[model samples]
Target chain A: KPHVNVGTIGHVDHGKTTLTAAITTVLAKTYGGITINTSHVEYDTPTRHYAHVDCPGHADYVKNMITGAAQMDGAILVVAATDGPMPQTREHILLGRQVGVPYIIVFLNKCDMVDDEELLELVEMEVRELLSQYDFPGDDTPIIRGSALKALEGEAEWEAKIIELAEALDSYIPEPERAIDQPFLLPIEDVFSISGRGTVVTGRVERGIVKVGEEVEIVGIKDTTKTTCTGVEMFRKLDEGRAGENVGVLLRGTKRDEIERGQVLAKPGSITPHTTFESEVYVLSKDEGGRHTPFFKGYRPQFYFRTTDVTGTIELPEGVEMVMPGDNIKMTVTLIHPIAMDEGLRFAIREGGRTVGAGVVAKIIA
Target chain B: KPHVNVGTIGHVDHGKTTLTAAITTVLAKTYGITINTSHVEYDTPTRHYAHVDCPGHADYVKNMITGAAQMDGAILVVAATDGPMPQTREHILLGRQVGVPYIIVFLNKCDMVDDEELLELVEMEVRELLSQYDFPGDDTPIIRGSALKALEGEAEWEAKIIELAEALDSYIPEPERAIDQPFLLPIEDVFSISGRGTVVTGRVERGIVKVGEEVEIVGIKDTTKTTCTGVEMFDEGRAGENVGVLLRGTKRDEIERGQVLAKPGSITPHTTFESEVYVLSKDEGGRHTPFFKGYRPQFYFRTTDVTGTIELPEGVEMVMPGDNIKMTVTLIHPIAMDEGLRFAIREGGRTVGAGVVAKII
Candidate 1:
């Protein structure tokens, strides 16, 4: 199927969130508007399906890009026509360029705040110049002018413009060469034992496919076990859950507390449990909730991946005695217990009361 | 067919991005749909083109490996009024990890930096940082200029942008896009000064190297896959030159002259291969004695030399200088090689043969 991952970049208050909701609400929901639940919202135009990712934080934003879940094949640069481009707009456009976004269109949002023609042209000229400066086709790049607020209300004028926006997006953005394919894995967010059914572990299917009766393994949280999924349920007694789904799976033999957050249900042999591994980490500066003082080798901190936080000691390279705030360190971390980690899964290293370092699982100790 | 992708990296509050905007205003390009990638399209007079690649994890690393993120250089900007931020280290680390070579430092907002001594101190600290990271900390160019001042069309600030561009044009060598070949660096010279362990210096003949990658040294001395303890060079070593690799626990004797260092399994240690040969003419310092089907001479490839036996094709009996022929060569010690590798056949240091490796068994 043809698909595009769309991201909204621009002003924080210039209605990026509203514009994302406007996309799904007007296009997907035939009746009226919608409130976005997760960071991503999905809807299909006549030609292709779009998984729109909203930026809540930089960490998650970059994670999605690397994780291939939120890389923008196409993106919308939302600028409030009333205010022109904001100071923060530079980073947005720059990020889109860096994330390898292929194409972009300008949304002169909040047109409702101002009158027509003069203001529109003025803001349009401003946007084009910025786009051109950032290396997008300033003159040729299509700038869609409208008010997302009016569009969400399902008004005649605004709905039609939104309709045009959808069409433009569908035709403009190219499809990815290949869909993201990965071994089956689901990060377990919640777990409980049902009276007759057994333990039900619920979370979004982060990758691949999972079906009822599939051979699966419960890993992390100091333990790992081979198990079979007895049933798959969503809002239904559904038999399967693939990537991009919220699901509840019934495990054959597991305690309610046995597999909770920080653990994952994965295809058998797909994940390895490791007591020690290397990771790439960004330490926070003192101003950013990090330690004011430098830290030494064998420095034990709480290492967090998914929802699991465990005690782990750090090891730096030779001749590098201590790590100062803001230094990027790729170090060895020996954990007290096994954590099911694969390359690219981001984690955080924290001391008591603050997150001092952010990291991702790198290579195995091999 | 490719140009450099340069990125602007620094603290979010610092005007590093404004400097990027200043690049084109002072000097910037056309745009294409570009398929699925966006390039901030600009080019210098000497180099073909440039794109300001954004720095980040997963996205940058994955994109680089997939050949999407092609960041070759970067501008490390810090507002001189303050200094390095937490994100500063992260950006540099990501740059280094994803093959961003030599970085240009801009002490932006220098006008606001106030005291000259404080600015000097900042420069010193940054240079020390470069040294710690194996870059030529002492001499890497640091330009103090205000990004906003450039955008404001000030002569002083705008000229710094031009100077920055020129330094980037000259200092950063155009990458040798021999990507199809495996990562290999010859042992041109060896150094023992570092605490990081045994260092082998050479120009990277192909591919790339990161600290902690496993590699093999083959020819006269062979090794099991040894973790690359460090990569200290003028630039990121990927299809690049002037690379110094520090290997864990490797001794000077282990890597001898005429041996090739390469990625594990990318090349094999082989004593025999069929090759298409061209014996140099007598005018080109050729051997006087061009012998028979059982003749044995020396073969030199990259940095290593081998004394190997040569076998002429069955139909051919003997050959003289300047003859093109096909033959099989066998060496005493296995050399790291693959099909299409070029080599020279020599005797007593006079070049007698040149050949392309055809097959190895």
Candidate 2:
């Protein structure tokens, strides 16, 4: 009712960049402010503000490393309509679902670039499979088509289509829930400070509100209290914002590099920091597909959650070595340091320093 | 580059509406604006300007006299991943290509609503089909599955998605082309000048640049100019807006009623136009399986294109009319149009007073 977040997900070169530009140009132009982030952020125009994390479909970015799936309200899964469902597309959809992102919008990008409807038909079928797997609610997703370049030709008409999209979003986003969305606690995604603005930090609200002028204690990986919020700026602008609003807060008691992106800041008595936790982890086979039976039990990945990075070992229900993508096996995570963590959000895993997979954080044992 | 327009084209009930709401909520809350509309418009607030049209799946709208197809630029062809290629989805895709809108992004809504991945797979195939049909250039449209209700929980993340969409639009829209988008001239589906202002309109532009003071003239059925510099406005309040610009021009030009908004500087000179046309008249038993040879020469749809009336007779070409959907024919009237018009852009036969004009405009 109040706010909603939309995410873009998929493999590299699948048109996420191009489609983002096309939609941004039409909608952003129609609306005055820059509601989306592109190369034009510094154009000096006071357009709508749209913030985007350039998650490369090719390079596993911040998302792949930390069950970052839930960070979005809804996800736009980009699929090459001509190529059907690629391996990475399949994973992207699954990640969107597992992270509890709720809404799933499948974008069949690159319609005019191909020459066969057969593959297009196949892609639709693949989307059907993914939707069913994720339990996306009902039969209401719209699968429209267009040449992005052509959209530029008929910009007004293209703007109309976006209007249609706006109406759809108005009708869909769920009623605002509890503190889960509108929160005061910030789960540090990234943090920095302005030379004159004191200490600045970016993150989701994991717990309570970090009101302006309120003293906030930033919990680091060492289970230590470090920084405090003297001023809160959502997107670098000073304001009073609720939970789920990505914000940049000004910490009066800390320096720029005192805490990292995984740290959590909250009002006193609102949060608890933990370094050990039991979670459901799924390890892939040597081929990286779903895990088979009693397999690679000693496998591990660089699991990241909040602002803490750790090496989490895979311990299946039966001490199995490997697990499939959807397998609900449980395991314990041994982090290098204590980081403010939550129950609902999952942990992201990286293999050999490269992002690979993630799992939910079940029970925390500090 | 300064402005961006986002559009959606899709089959009925495919979450086109939901996706719009989701994006709009995120954008609006993120930027504090409300640019959401139920119909096509060029200028509006920086919120999610959306055209939430009614269901085109049912034959009621399909067979109605004023069937609208080319109202939007970026189309969200909402075919169900749950079922095979539905009839309305196919028709809508065909019309999108016909309308030649610039951006076509597919949203497979209902991600959590269905019981099978079949919908996803089916949509994938449909996406592939659309890319092949979109022939203007490289098709890098975004295909995203979204749930609007879910967005309310994660406003910040949804905001990023809109940001991503805006970025995508910036990469695609090229300002140095024919400038065809600035003055979108949709065939006036209907004309009504209310007590508020003189309205000669259709759908708004997909990408609009004309300000209130800019010149816009309405033409007639014969390509005759009715009035010059007709002022366009969406509502009574015009606040330096660049929205779904509706011209409240001074005169409801009495001469021609069907013409749409156009800038003389943008259009090439030519009037009372005609072209070598192709028509698929009556479908016989042979045409059931989509035969390639049954196409015949038909003169009926051609006359309808120009006169908006089915005055000509139906004929077959080298192949029989009852066999195929293909036919090379000639037009009797001077129809001003472009050959780029693809199939399914035209109104249904029963919508016109005489009969169905051509299916492609």
Candidate 1 to truth, TM = 0.31
Can you give the lDDT of residue A237 in candidate 2?
A: 37
Q: Which candidate number would show the highest lDDT if scored against the true structure?
A: 1
lDDT (tens digit, per residue) of candidate 2 on A1-366: 144555466766566666566666666566540011222211011322333334653323223423332255555666655444554565666555544566666666656554457656656665776677756642566544444454545556544554444444445545336675443577777766677768777876654566677767776565556455567666533456567677777777577667777677776655677767776454433344433344356765677775667665555556455555434346666666566766656666765655455567756665
Judge candidate 1 at residue B146 and give its lDDT. Answer: 88
In terms of docking quality, model 2 is: incorrect
- Clashes per model (N, Cα, C within 3 A): 6, 206
> CA shift at A116, candidate 1, in angstroms?
48
In the range B1-361, model 2's lDDT, one tens digit per residue, is 2343344445556655566656555554545011123544232233223343444432212222123433334545454444324543454444443343464554454344464566556555665656555533234454544445436545434644564456444544433333335454443423445664444444443334344435344333344443322435442212233233334444444423333445545433222222212222333111111112211112222122332212122442122222112223234433333433322212212211111223333
Q: Which stretches of candidate 2 lie over 4 Å from their true place?
A: A1-5, A11-13, A33-49, A61-70, A110-125, A153-159, A169-206, A209-296, A299-312, A316-340, A343-366, B1-361
Model 1 accuracy (lDDT, Cα): 0.72
| Superposition error at B261 for model 1 (Å) | 52
Tens digits of per-residue lDDT, candidate 1, B71-116, equal 5667788889778776666556544433456888888998786689
Give me the displacement of residue B62 in model 1, in angstroms: 44
